[PDB]
Ligand binder design. Sequence first.
Ligand SMILES: Cc1cccc(C(CC[C@H](N)C(=O)O)(c2ccccc2)c2ccccc2)c1
Ligand SMILES: Nc1ncnc2c1ncn2[C@@H]1O[C@H](COP(=O)(O)OP(=O)(O)O)[C@@H](O)[C@H]1O
Ligand SMILES: [Mg+2]
Length: 336
Amino acid sequence: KNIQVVVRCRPFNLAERKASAHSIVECDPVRKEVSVRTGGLADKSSRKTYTFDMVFGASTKQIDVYRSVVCPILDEVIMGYNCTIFAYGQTGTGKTFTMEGERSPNEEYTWEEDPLAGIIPRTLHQIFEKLTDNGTEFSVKVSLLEIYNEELFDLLNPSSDVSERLQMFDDPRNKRGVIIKGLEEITVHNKDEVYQILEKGAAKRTTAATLMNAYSSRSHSVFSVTIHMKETTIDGEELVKIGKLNLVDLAGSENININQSLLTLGRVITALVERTPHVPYRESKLTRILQDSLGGRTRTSIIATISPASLNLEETLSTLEYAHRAKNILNKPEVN
Ligand SMILES: Cc1cccc(C(CC[C@H](N)C(=O)O)(c2ccccc2)c2ccccc2)c1
Ligand SMILES: Nc1ncnc2c1ncn2[C@@H]1O[C@H](COP(=O)(O)OP(=O)(O)O)[C@@H](O)[C@H]1O
Ligand SMILES: [Mg+2]
């Protein structure tokens, strides 16, 4: 039942080293604990310690995250589940790095072989391996929207202006899901179509950041992957199983209509752990989209990102307290 929650702590950055930052985070992958040093100069012994499903310290690499977190989820997508992974944390702590990753400088690497590639690129590659050897005819379609100030933007649309808005409506073929009217879904025929599609999306995203104040930290980003697989049974009946993967990069947790989605996510989580009736899904775009992933038939994970520095203490505790709280959400996962 319960949603899986894991924590990643990023290494120091150069500004932090320049400022003589001290660490206040200790990860123990084996005991699965994060432990925060909380007493500054006054109490050297003080700590807060939390247990998670998995933990990744400052030295963890993108391959590691992928191997430990995603391969398991990928398999269940391939058996025809819906899964969602998403990233939660204060701006600057590695949500985008974790979910998308970055390109290594000077085209030193092919995109499939980049050690900085995040979950999204690695996953699309992986989907073509696991599935070609297998034969089993399959199609893959991707989508990429952003929520900003409760407006919806389509990063993969042929339309040349990012500012053109999507709309959502209740799926009548699913009591817990939404249809995004206007959303471009692109068929991806081989692993060699991938980079160009991404690159398009990245450029459309660069423009948007210049149109909208604080775009990169105030927006939520929803990448989806849909898979259709043909299976003939032992009888010879030809049945098609469908699996979906949503990859969410949330707005910075530090914020808190500009904030409606982050707020309502908070409340939705609360109403679930405190077994309240009438969870407020309807009250935001994000939560209408994520509704099946919090409480519903989708299998969900959450990556809490944090910074190791003494300066970010209050936000770091904040992220851990909120993440740990979410371990108490139980979904009823089910195939399609
Ligand atoms: C839309 C997207 C999803 C996942 C990764 C990427 C990256 C990084 C996107 C960057 N994080 C951003 O937010 O703009 C990219 C694609 C194409 C050209 C350059 C970079 C990418 C793809 C594969 C390997 C590394 C980075 C872009
Ligand atoms: N796990 C990590 N390992 C190495 N560098 C990281 C890691 N996470 C983040 N960084 C660096 O810190 C910066 C902020 O990461 P980013 O993904 O933009 O965080 P967010 O999207 O949460 O604001 C980037 O320069 C990124 O390269
Ligand atoms: Mg970001």
